[PDB]
Symmetry: C3
Subunit: 413 residues, 3 copies
């Protein structure tokens, strides 16, 4: 038990994935699939329930504290320019991922049905009726139901009001707003501690999900996930080439001479799989150019937490894979809802220890595909089974997206 | 932007109403109504959504803090007599407004249908089953749904318990109740700051609502709102005459000699449209009679915030206009629910900057006519279009209702 | 009024029961039953609504504070052994009560229908799908609905995280978790103050419930409640004999010589009807054996609040009486849900002044039989009418269950 807890959790969940896939494949080939479905699948359904539990208090409390922490006069002009750049590039990354998932059609041809029936889709409202459904009718009724976008707006609009209250001239209202912000900060840190136990449970439920799904389907899923990782990587290299080379050549920096210097810390992201564990390495390559200290001392720790581009592209491709494996058809209107949710999920869940799972949970909730439906969990398990090589490429772009961002700011200043 | 914010908000929303009505009328006459319905109406639906958002946390937090602030031994006998008088006169004002809205039948003959279908009414429970539905089955489930009356009771019953906790002999429970009351006070003041931004947005959404509705209907609405303002003003003068002259002649004060002295500050309410901006003016006329300082130094600032009579009558007439324009039929049982909600809305939302809109929102929620249904918003926009002259008469009675109230207390003491 | 409040509340509600039963019987015999059903029953429906109101914030706030208060290193090994013993014996008591309620079939043959239709049962999920429904999908949506078991888990898992937060090394997170725990403690004590007013209202609503039910049915209910109290008492003596004599003879203590010393304070529980008002009496009989001071100074005040065995058996018999009078059929899966809820209700609602009513309300909510359905309230009133003699026997076993528990711990240590 204690020897199992002290193991590092990322290699733990990776070796759980690897031990799950092969064992599920041989149990699916030998014919013991029904025993797996009756005895192992509740250990994975418990894990997807524990993952759906944590997504609602985090997206309220963390967003309230984060919106209360900002100050546009204290945060300099360099800060607001790099925030504009990060949100614009993340929106373009989700748009390009949706484009490269419509061009490839991954998952089309599975016809997944777990219980014996297909996933019945919900009627999507028109385009105008969703931007009016951003603002909640009832702010308690948006938290009592799922409603990720009607509670992000309420959390941000509460945090800005708490900021306007905290610097007021009266004393009792300052004490009251201070105690309210401290209570919501306590709820946020309690959620951050529950996440660090659910992630310890994760290398059992993930093994259960893979050993269920690969025993159910088995053979065709490796072709479908090969098409998935091809549609991720060609759009990922197209993301780097198009977006970063245009945004570097429009400001006069030679992109080949930039990237041939940046490669020394770009390549360690491909083998480290952590955009924060390579921060002292990329500090050296930010020092290697002519960037002043007051820019790269501040921007790259912000870019390692807010600026996530490859994760933003993968959150479009792996949310079209679910809808194309479930037989649903995502119309326009809930197609830009993926963009508006994947940008604000990166700006919201900054610094959570479980960002990679709840950042997809709150997009699949916002589309209308909840993870408790048994058709969604199977395709989600296929995505988590292929997730390792995609995480390699995701970190590879997630580190480059900051070195191409501080150079633009150092060019204008 | 900054020049638009620094404008005073009441003249802003009034000139938005006036610029909305004429422009909507000429667009409705020239035949460009469908372009208005497809391009301008979301700016009004956004505003009615922003108005329905704010009504649930205010009616909980403000009521909790207000019920926690009272003390029946610190508040003197003069205070409890004037609270009994204010609530009795407000209940009689809602009853007389319901009478003068049944006698005139305003809005009967419109047959409003926006989407292409009429408003389907809900089955009203009997009389006994509503007074048992005052107390909530689930206090969290009353806030997660609308349920204005099952959350007013819970907020008051929580505030009284916090008052009984704060003066306890143990120390940890006193610290705990103090931090809880400070957190709910912080939520209340954060809602009061969000109201002051939604009211800044209001002179665009109000213009959108009027430019939609007057372009849809156009001609017959001026006759319907003329019947509405006639049914307001004849019941308003009957309110003054019957209620105030009987309650003044029963205690021996000559009402003609009283009102001929009170006219000097009664008439400025007709041209000021603010029952709080005429408080130093009516302090002079309270001084002009033989009222001692210890009564009129305290009562008139309480009467300008709690005692609202013309607003209570208008919240009966303009809630029968909605039900008679929508084809519904308000039975008895949800007819005294309007009385019990309009009294406790005046006692609850005391000091909010958005009292005039949420005080009608939480009555239309309590009847069963929510403002997100597109049939309700059109007739609500007709009421807001006629609202200016009614606000003049409402302030005219709202100021007189305190000068007739302190004289009774000065007569018994 | 003041002379009515200063009366002690337990003798008040008992004399309300006794004055209710006879008066309801003679009104049912003389033929004035419809006047009772139309004029008295809302006073009982108001009371069952006030009892259903209080069960949701208590089971969240009290559980959060109680789970935050524990420390397994500060609480000694004697403490964790006696907690294991108390929870094991309470689970065995609920199991034996369910056995002695299946063996007797109480309430089978009533065919109760108040409104004119029977109680429609809900479809029970299978056994695996309930242990996965323990963990909530949405922690706010578990509190917005009833969902007692999906909010007990969330309250415990929040309290443990607040405990792990409070001893952290950073200072701001310690301040934040301290203010959050103080706010939830304030909510818990506010609920404990509202309970002490609802219990003051209780000797009117209880009289209304009995005077309604005994006027409706009248004659056959005395045979049904005689079978109920027989099925309670034979299982209660079988509980004492089997469980306590096996758990005493397995550790070498002579049970006859133990109970002949323990009788001097066991017999006062039969006439006192209070397991806490006999605590100084049973301290003497704990001193009368060879128990050291460091065990019985700590354990018996814990056993009078956590260890409830006869109440645990009665919460199985009086929850099979409701399901057998309503025509429903409790399957296995919602039969061990009664065990898992009645154990955790004893561990949760420890120290509340209204434990005996909400501890059954949160079991009938967890089965799927809410107390607002008019078929459930009649059989619940039959249980409350017979409740006095059952409370005598319940206290008789509830006191013995601690004297048989400290002796085992004094034997191992
Ligand atoms: C606007 C976004 C840029 C403003 C700074 C910011 O986004 O703060 C972030 C907090 O979350 C938010 O800003 C949400 C507010 C949305 C503003 C629109 C986290 O940045 P961090 O430096 O990693 O600190 C982590 C502590 N939670
Ligand atoms: C089985 C059902 C699983 C339920 C998961 C509930 C998560 C519990 C939340 C609170 C527990 C917690 O925060 O501590 C966490 C420990 O959680 C656990 O070990 C319980 C998980 C047991 C099964 C794991 C396999 C670790 O947090 P930390 O910050 O790394 O602290 C290390 C020592 N100070
Ligand atoms: C009973 C009503 C009279 C007791 C005093 C009172 O109503 O306080 C009001 C607070 O709200 C309440 O009283 C709700 C409690 C209902 C008591 C029944 C506001 O009066 P204010 O002088 O304008 O102070 C504004 C600060 N929120
Ligand atoms: C477009 C969607 C509209 C959303 C309205 C959300 C309301 C934001 C709530 C927080 C903003 C706030 O409280 O400040 C308020 C400013 O709000 C705004 O200006 C934003 C509204 C922009 C569109 C208005 C036309 C003013 O409050 P104050 O007490 O008068 O302070 C004056 C300077 N200290
Ligand atoms: C494990 C249960 C034993 C740990 C101690 C305990 O249960 O505390 C109880 C508090 O409630 C809880 O423990 C719930 C936590 C469940 C732990 C599993 C009450 O015991 P008390 O001595 O009567 O104090 C009353 C103050 N609320
Ligand atoms: C009729 C509807 C009944 C509604 C019950 C609402 C309960 C009110 C909750 C707050 C009242 C409260 O806590 O005080 C309680 C008083 O409650 C009442 O007397 C109101 C009940 C009136 C009808 C009773 C027959 C007593 O608490 P305490 O700890 O014994 O303090 C004694 C003097 N310090
Ligand atoms: N690739 C980036 C970067 O590792 O820095 C990017 O970072 C986001 C990030 C940061 C810290 C933790 C996480 N969480 C995970 O990796 C994760 C992975 C799998 C699960 C699972 F339990 F399997 F669902 C849960 C969480 C994600 C990413 O992984 O998408
Ligand atoms: N007539 C009284 C007195 O002005 O003092 C009485 O005061 C209540 C009062 C006080 C302060 C602000 C408000 N709010 C408004 O006037 C208001 C008017 C229109 C809207 C709109 F946005 F159009 F819905 C919103 C709010 C109301 C009343 O207006 O009904
Ligand atoms: N018999 C035990 C012991 O009296 O100590 C055991 O104690 C639990 C306990 C302790 C303190 C108060 C309570 N509450 C009640 O007795 C009670 C009885 C009836 C009602 C009613 F209002 F009639 F529903 C409400 C509450 C229960 C029990 O009564 O079940």
């Amino acid at each position: 038990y204690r020897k199992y807890i002290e193991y590092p959790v990322l290699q733990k969940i990776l070796i759980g994935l690897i031990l799950g896939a092969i064992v599920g494949l041989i149990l699916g080939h030998y014919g013991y699939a029904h025993a797996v479905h009756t005895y192992v699948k509740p250990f994975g359904d418990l894990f997807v329930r524990l993952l759906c539990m944590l997504v609602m208090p985090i997206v309220f409390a963390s967003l309230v504290v984060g919106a209360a922490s900002i100050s546009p006069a204290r945060l300099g002009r360099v800060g607001v320019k790099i925030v504009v750049y990060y949100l614009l590039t993340s929106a373009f990354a989700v748009t390009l991922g949706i484009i490269m998932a419509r061009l490839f059609n991954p998952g089309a041809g599975i016809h997944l049905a777990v219980g014996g029936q297909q996933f019945q889709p919900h009627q999507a409202p028109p385009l105008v009726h969703i931007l009016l459904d951003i603002v909640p009718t009832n702010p308690f009724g948006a938290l009592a139901n799922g409603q990720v976008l009607p509670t992000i707006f309420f959390a941000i609009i509460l945090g800005i009001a708490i900021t306007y209250l905290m610097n007021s001239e009266n004393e009792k209202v300052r004490k009251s707003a201070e105690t309210l912000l401290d209570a919501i900060n306590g709820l946020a840190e309690a959620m951050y501690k529950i996440v660090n136990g659910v992630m310890q449970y994760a290398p059992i439920g993930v093994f259960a999900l893979i050993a269920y799904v690969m025993a159910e389907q088995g053979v065709h899923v490796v072709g479908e996930l090969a098409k998935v990782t091809a549609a991720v990587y060609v759009g990922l290299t197209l993301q780097i080439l198009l977006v970063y080379f245009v945004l570097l050549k429009i400001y006069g920096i030679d992109p080949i001479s930039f990237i041939k210097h940046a490669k020394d810390a770009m390549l360690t992201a491909f083998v480290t799989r952590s955009s924060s564990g390579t921060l002292p390495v990329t500090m050296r390559v930010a020092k290697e150019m002519g960037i002043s200290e007051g820019i790269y001392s501040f921007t790259l720790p912000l870019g390692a937490t807010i600026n996530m581009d490859g994760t933003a592209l993968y959150q479009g491709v792996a949310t079209f894979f679910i809808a194309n494996a479930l037989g649903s058809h995502l119309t326009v209107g809930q197609q830009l809802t993926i963009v508006l949710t994947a940008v604000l999920a990166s700006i919201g869940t900054a610094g959570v220890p479980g960002a990679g799972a709840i950042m997809l949970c709150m997009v699949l909730h916002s589309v209308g595909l909840p993870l408790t439906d048994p058709n969604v969990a199977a395709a989600y398990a296929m995505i988590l089974g292929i997730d390792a090589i995609l995480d390699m490429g995701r970190t590879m772009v997630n580190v480059t997206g900051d070195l191409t961002g501080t150079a633009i700011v150092a060019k204008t200043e």
